[PDB]
Amino acid sequence: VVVKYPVNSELANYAEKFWKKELAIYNLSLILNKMTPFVKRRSESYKSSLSAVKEIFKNVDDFQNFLNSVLRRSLDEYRVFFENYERLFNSFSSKIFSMRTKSRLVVGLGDES
């Protein structure tokens, strides 16, 4: 499918390669927010919604796997972050507890995008 990236000249070709899995990217929010694909869905109509972006991939499952594959590459750095976060908690003698999502969770659904 035809995809266009309205960013600076040299970034546009790299963003193309990232979304096409021709080049590895290690930051999820970066590729999502600053390298938004504008997908030529039909005619001269370009779209930047997740519904249109999904067409860059074989299927919904392929799209999901890509996102999480990018996400997971921060694991090593995130572990140190989470450990310092726990150290932060205990320095303030915090009441620490863990809970699990019982259903789907979406915080910040309405952030302008």
Added chain:
RNA sequence: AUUGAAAGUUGUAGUAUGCGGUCCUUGCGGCU
């Protein structure tokens, strides 16, 4: 041929000491 002649309001001196832009606030509702 005068109450006249002569005489630097100058010298020294930190607008400074104390003081959290903070507190209260579910990016959500379902509409156009």
